[PDB]
């Protein structure tokens, strides 16, 4: 029978809806509030679509040919909203700074951030694990990555939460201006006073033809990292913790062998992908997937959460198996826009989740599954809150 889509029963558990879509309606127009968008749910179609040159990030394909003259490529020069060759240049410049060592160097800091939060949580609560733990880690990590002065952090975090929906969308519109101004000035302090962190690194960036990020590009890139790395990581933590709380068997396996945490994080990303659909693509011309044709100029979402449970890709896809092999999941995307932060996200997930279950072996949900409340956000699989009882700290 007809499962609700992006409404009703869908928000608490969209997986049955996605399974029915993959089986019966794999390429489907969705009447979303701000406008209709097409959804692809089969793994093979999603994978193809990510490398389909006819599926663009350039919103100007929504305009008929005669209306394009005046029009800018992007509303903000963010690399995620570009096609090659412009994307290729920004990806080359920023990518330089995302070194293996920079990631390894962050691990002790992420560990300290997690331990600091864990220390302040009570044994008997109940406590909202989202507000109190998952929400805090990723922005504190972004602060560390970028080199936001520790005095400016609680302020930085404050305006960051405003971007992750506190009140109406009037304030975010100006919170961007605050973060833009703040980052703009910080970049100046880094220029005068180089440090080992990312903002400083991004200024040095210079290819042999002398190329470098403009002042405008630098701030847009920093804002992109904040936005791309905050809510996403929060939901990796929230969703992975929930997966363990709801699968006693897998939780036992991890407890007996803590080294499974890396494999576990890959499986959480597959089993309940936090970026549930990829951000919109635009058809540059008509495309046909699973015999269904999407006209030129349309908006298209790639169903990552749906694709990651496609049995044509992964056998027993509805089973959580933290020993499973990750291979080929689409939770970080695929092709040219593949998540720049994937290594950092994976690090944050394994520290946040691994340390929590190590610190609090008797952690338990304090409500029934049917009582969990998810954010009604098209591209997000995210708990609004997670009531838990932390239980005693491990011996
Ligand atoms: C925590 C879990 C995360 C998930 C599931 C995730 C997922 C994704 C996905 C699916 C894409 C590609 C979107 C598309 O092709 O339309 C992407 C791109 C991107 N992500 Fe992540 N992300 C995560 C964390 C992060 C973090 C921590 C950072 C930075 C520290 C980051 C930075 C970026 C950037 C800059 C892009 C754009 C890359 C490009 O356009 O070339 N992400 N992410």
Contacts of 192 (CB under 8 A, 6+ apart): none
* 40 alpha carbon – ligand 1 mean position (Å): 19
- Using CA atoms, how far residue 365 sits from 124, 212, 238, 245, 359, in Å, is 12, 49, 12, 7, 16
What phi and psi, each to the nearest 5 degrees, are found at residue 361? -60, -25
For ligand 1, is residue 232 a contact (CB within 6 Å)? yes
Could you tell me which residues come within 8 angstroms of residue 230 by beta carbon, excluding any fewer than 6 positions away? Answer: 138, 139, 142, 160, 163, 164
Contact 292, 27 (CB under 8 A): yes
Domains of the chain, by residue range, sit at 1-395
CB 280 within 8 A of CB 379: no
Phi, psi angle pair for 281, to nearest 5°: -110, 160
Exposure class string for 263-272: b at 16+ Cβ within 10 A, else e? bbbbbbbbbb
- Residues whose CB is less than 8 angstroms from the CB of residue 1 and which lie 6 or more positions away in sequence, other chains included: none
Distance 34 CA to ligand 1 centre (A): 23
Q: Is residue 372 a contact partner of residue 115, using CB atoms and an 8 Å limit?
A: no
CB 374 within 8 A of CB 381: yes
Q: Which helix (H) or strand (E) holds 299?
A: strand 299-302
Element (H, E) at 388: strand 387-389
Closest-lying ligand 1 atom to the alpha carbon of residue 344? 27
Is 289:49 a contact under the CB 8 Å cutoff?
Answer: yes
Question: Would you call 76 helix, strand, or coil by DSSP?
Answer: coil
Contact 328, 334 (CB under 8 A): no
- Angle at Cα 147 formed by Cα 111 and Cα 87, nearest 5°? 105
Is residue 143 part of an annotated ligand binding site? no
Residue 306 tokens read as 């749906």
CATH number for region 1-395 = 1.10.630.10
Q: What are the backbone dihedrals phi and psi of residue 306, each rounded to the nearest 5 degrees, phi first?
A: -70, -50
Ligand 1 pocket, residue 236 CB under 6 Å = yes
Structure's resolution in angstroms: 1.8
- CA-to-CA dists, residue 359 to 107, 117, 226, 354, angstroms: 17, 11, 28, 9
For ligand 1, atom 21: residue with the closest CA:
339
Instruction: Report helix, strand or coil for 59.
Output: helix
Return the bridge partners of 288, or none. Answer: 293
For every residue of 88-149, DSSP letters joined together read HHHHHHHHTT--HHHHHHHHHHHHHHHHHHHHHS-SSS-EEHIIIIITHHHHHHHHHHHT--
Residues 43/46/47/52 CA torsion (nearest 10 deg)? 160
Q: Report how far apart, in Å, the C-alpha atoms of 193 and of each of 144, 197, 199 are.
A: 16, 11, 11
């Amino acid at each position: 029978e007809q499962h609700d889509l992006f409404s009703g029963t869908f928000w608490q558990n969209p997986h049955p809806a996605y399974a029915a879509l993959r089986a019966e309606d794999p390429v489907r127009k969705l009447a979303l509030p701000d406008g209709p968008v097409w959804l692809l749910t089969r793994y093979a179609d999603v994978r193809e679509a990510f490398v389909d040159p006819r599926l663009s990030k350039d919103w100007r394909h929504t305009l008929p040919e005669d209306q394009r003259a005046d029009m800018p490529a992007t509303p903000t020069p963010m690399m995620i909203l570009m096609d090659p060759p412009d994307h290729t240049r920004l990806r080359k410049l920023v990518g330089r700074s995302f070194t293996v060592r920079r990631m390894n160097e962050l691990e002790p800091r992420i560990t300290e951030i997690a331990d600091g939060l864990l220390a302040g949580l009570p044994t008997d609560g109940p406590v909202d694990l989202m507000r109190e733990y998952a929400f805090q880690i990723p922005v504190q990590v972004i602060c560390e990555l970028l080199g936001v002065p520790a005095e400016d952090r609680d302020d930085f975090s404050a305006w960051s939460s405003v971007l992750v929906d506190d009140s109406p969308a009037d304030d975010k519109n100006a919170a961007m201006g605050k973060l833009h101004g703040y980052l703009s000035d910080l970049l100046e302090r880094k220029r005068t006073e180089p440090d080992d962190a990312l903002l400083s690194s991004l200024l040095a960036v210079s290819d042999e033809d002398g190329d470098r990020l403009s002042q405008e590009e630098l701030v847009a890139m920093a804002m992109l990292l904040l936005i791309a790395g905050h809510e996403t990581t929060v939901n990796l933590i929230g969703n992975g913790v929930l997966a363990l709380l709801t699968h006693p068997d897998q939780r036992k396996l991890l407890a007996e062998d803590p080294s499974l945490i890396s494999s576990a994080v890959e499986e959480f990303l597959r089993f309940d992908s936090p970026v549930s659909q990829a951000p919109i693509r635009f058809t540059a011309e008509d495309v046909t997937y699973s015999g269904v044709t999407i006209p030129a100029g349309e908006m298209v979402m790639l169903g990552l959460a749906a694709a990651n449970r496609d049995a044509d890709w992964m056998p027993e896809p509805d089973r959580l198996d933290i020993t499973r092999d990750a291979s080929g999941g689409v939770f970080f995307g695929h092709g040219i826009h593949f998540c720049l932060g994937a290594q950092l996200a994976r690090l944050e997930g394994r520290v946040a989740i691994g340390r929590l279950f190590a610190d609090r072996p008797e952690l338990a949900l304090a409500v029934g599954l049917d009582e969990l409340v998810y954010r009604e956000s098209t591209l997000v699989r995210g708990l609004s809150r997670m009531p838990v009882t932390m239980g005693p700290r491990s011996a």
